[PDB]
Ligand binder design. Structure first.
Ligand SMILES: [Zn+2]
Lengths: 226, 61
């Protein structure tokens, strides 16, 4: 998260920290969010061999008695996910056991009614990602408020599709999601409407988030079935 | 194992930058698209690389 603030500890108890073990060398790291006791929603590009999810964290470098670490047992990457476009950058992860509900660990279930969110709303995203181009990931969970832009502000991105993607972050500001925030939720009026997907290597906003409303059928499908 | 045939500067933060000759281990090539997820053997970083910029190490002279 660039230009954000430190979250009030445990104030977003659905936030998931993902370690994705690919093989013998440094892991990859993503965010995500607990939408049901044994389901975490994240980005498709955070897929890998095995994934450990840490729930209940604030400072991720210091083990806490709020932590629940759970293995992922099943990955549901969106079947139409494509690396040239990064369309359908969305994935559900079924956890080995249901998380236990605590002050620090809670779900963020969707409201019954999805709706299409237009440009102009100010939404909030949280994560442990890098705080700048040359910066390491944040030890503590950060959040930032970002403006939804007209999709024309993202026309420089390949095949950007207003129906599939949100265009997020006023270009005249430095505030933005960044590397390591992948898969984290963008909440508008407290409702998850976006998933951090990608943006410019140089961190110049806007960035691209998966538009959750488009995927509401598919998500509901997988849950009502697993 | 794969080798960079050309230099590449990433435009998307999901992607790695690299120089001709840098070596990679491929982690995922399953999804459609011109990009494979890889890990640089130089830096240890993981990200997407253009599949056409690399070749198996034993497929170069
Ligand atoms: Zn705490």
């Amino acid at each position: 998260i660039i230009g954000g603030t430190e979250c009030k500890p445990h104030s977003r108890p659905y936030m998931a920290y993902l370690e994705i073990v690919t093989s013998n060398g440094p892991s990859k790291f993503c965010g995500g969010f607990l939408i049901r006791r044994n389901f975490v929603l994240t980005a498709a590009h955070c897929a890998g061999r095995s994934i450990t999810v840490t729930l209940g964290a604030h400072n991720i470098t210091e083990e806490e008695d709020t932590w629940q670490k759970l293995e992922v047992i099943k990955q549901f990457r969106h079947p139409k996910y494509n690396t040239s476009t990064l369309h359908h950058d969305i994935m559900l992860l079924k956890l080995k056991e249901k998380a236990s509900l605590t002050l620090a660990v809670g779900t963020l279930p969707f409201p019954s009614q999805f709706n299409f969110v237009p440009p102009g709303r100010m939404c909030r995203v949280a994560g442990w990602g890098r705080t700048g181009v040359l910066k390491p990931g944040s030890d503590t969970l950060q959040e930032v408020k970002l403006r939804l832009m007209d999709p024309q502000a993202c026309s420089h991105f390949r095949d950007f599709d207003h129906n599939l993607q949100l265009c997020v972050g006023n270009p005249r500001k430095t505030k933005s999601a960044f590397k390591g925030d992948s898969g984290g939720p963008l909440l508008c009026a407290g409702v998850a409407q976006g998933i951090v997907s990608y943006g410019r290597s140089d961190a110049k906003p806007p960035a691209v988030f998966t538009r959750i409303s488009h995927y509401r059928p598919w998500i509901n499908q997988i849950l009502q079935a697993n | 194992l794969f080798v960079a045939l050309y230099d590449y500067q990433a435009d998307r933060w999901t992607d790695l930058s690299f120089h001709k000759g840098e070596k990679f281990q491929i982690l995922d090539a399953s999804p459609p698209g011109d990009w494979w997820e890889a890990r640089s053997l130089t830096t240890g970083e993981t990200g997407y690389i253009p599949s056409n910029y690399v070749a198996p190490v034993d497929s170069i002279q």
